[PDB]
Design a protein around this ligand. Structure first.
Ligand code: CYZ
Lengths: 45, 49
């Protein structure tokens, strides 16, 4: 009744961590863009 | 020799020196939950955050 998960199982699990990291990095780019866009707009005002 | 009917029931069996009871592992505090739950809690922790 014993079992052991293989490398393929650990590839999907490892994909989840990388995907979440990319999501954080993608949101941080969206945040930085708008911050730069607002900073420039304020300076022109 | 002319045997008779079995008066009792037996069967080959392995005898080993009774291995003394073991000490709960150093990480026994993870026993209450299966390894799958601990793995998924980490995923949930990352996903929620
Ligand atoms: N349970 S046991 O091993 O004590 C046990 C086992 C057995 C007993 C009697 C006892 Cl008490 N008798 C039977 C016997 C009764 C009739 C049916 C099978 C033989 C002829 N053989 S057995 O099935 O080998």
């Amino acid at each position: 009744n014993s079992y052991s998960y293989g490398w393929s199982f650990y590839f999907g699990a490892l994909s989840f961590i990388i995907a979440e990291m990319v999501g954080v990095l993608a949101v941080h780019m969206f945040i930085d863009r708008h911050k730069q866009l607002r900073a420039t707009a304020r300076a022109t005002d | 020799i002319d045997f008779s009917k079995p008066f009792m029931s037996l069967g080959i069996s392995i005898m080993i020196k009774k291995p003394q009871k073991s000490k709960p592992g150093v990480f026994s505090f993870l026993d209450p939950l299966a390894y799958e739950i601990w793995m998924c809690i980490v995923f949930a922790y990352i996903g929620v955050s």
